[PDB]
Every structure is written in C-alpha cells, then in structure tokens.
PDB file of C-alpha atoms in Angstrom:
ATOM      1  CA  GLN A   1      -0.017  -0.143  -0.138  1.00  0.00           C
ATOM      2  CA  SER A   2       0.850   3.427  -0.710  1.00  0.00           C
ATOM      3  CA  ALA A   3      -0.345   6.759   0.346  1.00  0.00           C
ATOM      4  CA  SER A   4       0.927  10.335  -0.248  1.00  0.00           C
ATOM      5  CA  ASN A   5       0.774  13.890   1.410  1.00  0.00           C
ATOM      6  CA  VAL A   6       0.789  12.055   5.181  1.00  0.00           C
ATOM      7  CA  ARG A   7       2.243  13.959   8.104  1.00  0.00           C
ATOM      8  CA  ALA A   8       4.879  12.495  10.007  1.00  0.00           C
ATOM      9  CA  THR A   9       5.493  13.632  13.656  1.00  0.00           C
ATOM     10  CA  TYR A  10       8.558  12.256  16.047  1.00  0.00           C
ATOM     11  CA  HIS A  11       8.685  10.465  19.460  1.00  0.00           C
ATOM     12  CA  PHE A  12      12.153  10.118  20.986  1.00  0.00           C
ATOM     13  CA  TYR A  13      12.051   6.178  20.874  1.00  0.00           C
ATOM     14  CA  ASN A  14      15.866   6.326  20.914  1.00  0.00           C
ATOM     15  CA  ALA A  15      15.809   2.971  19.357  1.00  0.00           C
ATOM     16  CA  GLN A  16      19.849   2.815  19.280  1.00  0.00           C
ATOM     17  CA  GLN A  17      20.326   4.037  22.880  1.00  0.00           C
ATOM     18  CA  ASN A  18      18.030   1.162  24.019  1.00  0.00           C
ATOM     19  CA  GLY A  19      19.925  -1.300  22.288  1.00  0.00           C
ATOM     20  CA  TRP A  20      17.319  -1.592  19.397  1.00  0.00           C
ATOM     21  CA  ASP A  21      15.113  -3.538  22.289  1.00  0.00           C
ATOM     22  CA  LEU A  22      11.495  -2.991  21.549  1.00  0.00           C
ATOM     23  CA  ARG A  23      10.459  -3.875  25.135  1.00  0.00           C
ATOM     24  CA  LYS A  24      12.409  -1.228  26.220  1.00  0.00           C
ATOM     25  CA  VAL A  25      11.231   1.508  24.219  1.00  0.00           C
ATOM     26  CA  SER A  26       7.519   0.026  24.915  1.00  0.00           C
ATOM     27  CA  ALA A  27       6.663  -0.433  20.953  1.00  0.00           C
ATOM     28  CA  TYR A  28       3.514  -2.244  20.631  1.00  0.00           C
ATOM     29  CA  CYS A  29       4.747  -4.642  18.613  1.00  0.00           C
ATOM     30  CA  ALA A  30       7.389  -6.153  21.311  1.00  0.00           C
ATOM     31  CA  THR A  31       4.889  -8.724  21.776  1.00  0.00           C
ATOM     32  CA  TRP A  32       5.707 -10.644  18.600  1.00  0.00           C
ATOM     33  CA  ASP A  33       8.740  -9.059  17.411  1.00  0.00           C
ATOM     34  CA  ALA A  34      11.145  -8.632  20.462  1.00  0.00           C
ATOM     35  CA  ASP A  35      12.847 -11.600  20.047  1.00  0.00           C
ATOM     36  CA  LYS A  36      13.676 -11.370  16.389  1.00  0.00           C
ATOM     37  CA  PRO A  37      17.446 -11.425  15.345  1.00  0.00           C
ATOM     38  CA  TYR A  38      19.563  -8.027  16.389  1.00  0.00           C
ATOM     39  CA  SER A  39      20.341  -7.797  12.853  1.00  0.00           C
ATOM     40  CA  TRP A  40      16.511  -7.607  11.835  1.00  0.00           C
ATOM     41  CA  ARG A  41      15.627  -5.255  14.859  1.00  0.00           C
ATOM     42  CA  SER A  42      18.368  -2.944  14.019  1.00  0.00           C
ATOM     43  CA  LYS A  43      17.932  -3.305  10.095  1.00  0.00           C
ATOM     44  CA  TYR A  44      15.853  -0.225   9.778  1.00  0.00           C
ATOM     45  CA  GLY A  45      15.234   3.273  12.034  1.00  0.00           C
ATOM     46  CA  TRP A  46      11.626   2.747  14.033  1.00  0.00           C
ATOM     47  CA  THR A  47       8.255   4.237  13.159  1.00  0.00           C
ATOM     48  CA  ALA A  48       4.596   4.155  14.640  1.00  0.00           C
ATOM     49  CA  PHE A  49       2.271   3.824  11.684  1.00  0.00           C
ATOM     50  CA  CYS A  50      -1.686   5.042  11.636  1.00  0.00           C
ATOM     51  CA  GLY A  51      -1.913   5.671   7.644  1.00  0.00           C
ATOM     52  CA  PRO A  52      -5.182   6.407   5.891  1.00  0.00           C
ATOM     53  CA  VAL A  53      -4.028   3.013   3.312  1.00  0.00           C
ATOM     54  CA  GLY A  54      -2.665  -0.025   4.404  1.00  0.00           C
ATOM     55  CA  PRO A  55      -2.418  -2.176   7.607  1.00  0.00           C
ATOM     56  CA  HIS A  56      -2.282  -0.733  10.972  1.00  0.00           C
ATOM     57  CA  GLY A  57      -1.750  -2.497  14.774  1.00  0.00           C
ATOM     58  CA  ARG A  58      -0.967  -5.818  15.025  1.00  0.00           C
ATOM     59  CA  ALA A  59      -1.260  -6.785  11.245  1.00  0.00           C
ATOM     60  CA  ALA A  60       1.257  -4.192  10.423  1.00  0.00           C
ATOM     61  CA  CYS A  61       3.721  -5.229  12.851  1.00  0.00           C
ATOM     62  CA  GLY A  62       7.471  -5.577  11.467  1.00  0.00           C
ATOM     63  CA  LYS A  63       6.601  -4.189   7.981  1.00  0.00           C
ATOM     64  CA  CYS A  64       8.741  -1.854   6.203  1.00  0.00           C
ATOM     65  CA  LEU A  65       8.101   1.617   4.500  1.00  0.00           C
ATOM     66  CA  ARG A  66       9.972   3.742   2.216  1.00  0.00           C
ATOM     67  CA  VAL A  67       9.109   7.369   3.317  1.00  0.00           C
ATOM     68  CA  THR A  68      10.043  10.187   1.197  1.00  0.00           C
ATOM     69  CA  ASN A  69       9.712  13.942   2.610  1.00  0.00           C
ATOM     70  CA  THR A  70       7.948  15.971   0.266  1.00  0.00           C
ATOM     71  CA  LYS A  71       9.339  19.160  -0.054  1.00  0.00           C
ATOM     72  CA  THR A  72      13.149  17.923   0.132  1.00  0.00           C
ATOM     73  CA  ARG A  73      13.044  14.488  -1.670  1.00  0.00           C
ATOM     74  CA  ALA A  74      15.118  12.943   0.944  1.00  0.00           C
ATOM     75  CA  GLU A  75      14.163   9.119   1.690  1.00  0.00           C
ATOM     76  CA  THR A  76      14.826   6.566   4.287  1.00  0.00           C
ATOM     77  CA  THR A  77      13.116   3.096   4.737  1.00  0.00           C
ATOM     78  CA  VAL A  78      11.915   2.481   7.992  1.00  0.00           C
ATOM     79  CA  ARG A  79      10.184  -0.827  10.099  1.00  0.00           C
ATOM     80  CA  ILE A  80       6.547  -0.424  12.068  1.00  0.00           C
ATOM     81  CA  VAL A  81       7.326  -1.223  15.594  1.00  0.00           C
ATOM     82  CA  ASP A  82       4.210   0.606  16.615  1.00  0.00           C
ATOM     83  CA  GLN A  83       0.883   2.231  16.451  1.00  0.00           C
ATOM     84  CA  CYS A  84      -0.120   6.127  16.400  1.00  0.00           C
ATOM     85  CA  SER A  85      -3.049   8.693  16.477  1.00  0.00           C
ATOM     86  CA  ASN A  86      -3.014  10.688  13.237  1.00  0.00           C
ATOM     87  CA  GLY A  87      -3.284   9.220   9.995  1.00  0.00           C
ATOM     88  CA  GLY A  88       0.436   8.959   9.398  1.00  0.00           C
ATOM     89  CA  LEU A  89       3.583   8.141  10.728  1.00  0.00           C
ATOM     90  CA  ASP A  90       5.241   8.993  14.311  1.00  0.00           C
ATOM     91  CA  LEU A  91       8.612   8.633  13.584  1.00  0.00           C
ATOM     92  CA  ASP A  92      11.917   8.141  15.806  1.00  0.00           C
ATOM     93  CA  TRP A  93      13.712  11.289  16.091  1.00  0.00           C
ATOM     94  CA  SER A  94      16.836   9.477  14.406  1.00  0.00           C
ATOM     95  CA  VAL A  95      14.871   9.390  11.353  1.00  0.00           C
ATOM     96  CA  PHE A  96      12.832  12.243  11.388  1.00  0.00           C
ATOM     97  CA  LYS A  97      16.111  14.376  11.755  1.00  0.00           C
ATOM     98  CA  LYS A  98      17.573  11.843   8.583  1.00  0.00           C
ATOM     99  CA  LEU A  99      14.572  13.223   6.450  1.00  0.00           C
ATOM    100  CA  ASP A 100      14.054  16.668   7.759  1.00  0.00           C
ATOM    101  CA  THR A 101      16.914  17.969   5.255  1.00  0.00           C
ATOM    102  CA  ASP A 102      16.436  21.810   5.669  1.00  0.00           C
ATOM    103  CA  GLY A 103      15.504  21.704   9.321  1.00  0.00           C
ATOM    104  CA  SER A 104      11.701  23.148   8.662  1.00  0.00           C
ATOM    105  CA  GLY A 105      10.397  19.828   9.959  1.00  0.00           C
ATOM    106  CA  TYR A 106      11.889  20.429  13.719  1.00  0.00           C
ATOM    107  CA  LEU A 107      10.277  24.344  13.270  1.00  0.00           C
ATOM    108  CA  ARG A 108       6.876  23.194  12.376  1.00  0.00           C
ATOM    109  CA  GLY A 109       6.692  19.979  14.340  1.00  0.00           C
ATOM    110  CA  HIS A 110       6.304  17.767  11.148  1.00  0.00           C
ATOM    111  CA  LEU A 111       7.226  16.445   7.899  1.00  0.00           C
ATOM    112  CA  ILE A 112       4.810  16.294   4.917  1.00  0.00           C
ATOM    113  CA  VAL A 113       5.772  12.486   3.703  1.00  0.00           C
ATOM    114  CA  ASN A 114       4.808   9.740   1.226  1.00  0.00           C
ATOM    115  CA  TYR A 115       4.871   6.224   2.099  1.00  0.00           C
ATOM    116  CA  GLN A 116       4.973   2.933   0.369  1.00  0.00           C
ATOM    117  CA  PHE A 117       4.935  -0.822   1.810  1.00  0.00           C
ATOM    118  CA  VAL A 118       8.352  -2.390   0.670  1.00  0.00           C
ATOM    119  CA  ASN A 119      10.110  -5.495   0.949  1.00  0.00           C
ATOM    120  CA  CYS A 120      12.104  -5.897   4.377  1.00  0.00           C
ATOM    121  CA  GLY A 121      14.888  -7.755   2.660  1.00  0.00           C
ATOM    122  CA  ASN A 122      17.003 -10.193   4.433  1.00  0.00           C
TER     123      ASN A 122
END
C-alpha cells in the first residue's frame, strides 16, 4: 500500500540508545517482534504507523515503509514497531532528523511525506 501527503511527527524512541530493544522503548509490536534477531531489529530505523492506506496495529508489525520527504525529496526505509494516532507516521527522532534535510520539520513539528510498503529484505 501507499499514500501521499501524510503527516509524520517524531517521538524519542531512542532506538539505538535502547540497544534496538522493542520492549525497552514500550513499542506495541514488542509482544510479537522483540525476540527477532538483533540484525532484524536494527536493520532500519523505527516508526509508529497509522496511515490512511494499509494495515495498522498488529497486522502491520515488522513491515517496512519507504518514506519520502515531499518537500526535500530525502528518503529512508523504516520498520513499523508501533501504532499512532493521526493518520500518519510517528518517526523516531533519528529518522525524522535524517529526512528533515532543511530543518523546517523541526521548526513546524512535522514533515509531509509519502510512504510505500516495501520488501524488508534479508
């Protein structure tokens, strides 16, 4: 699934500073994904998801999104680890910072992004 022009906020999951441990950050998906390999947990930065198109909640856990800053064209791939309110994304700060290439997202409090569910790879 995909959608355009969705709001992405940020939350301090601090994934890296929690050793990529989903239980430590209190991620919804910890119940099913916390014991996946370290290589899997740490492959991609983390997000909450609650977009207009595609699964959310339990069915979305562990899936990957390609996210594009509509304003700057910066991109990254994230892993769904949590659920959110809003019809968009709640990115870990590290991910938001990566995408916020002009700093305007930090100032306003959100980015406008497109997303697409993508193969997570191996």
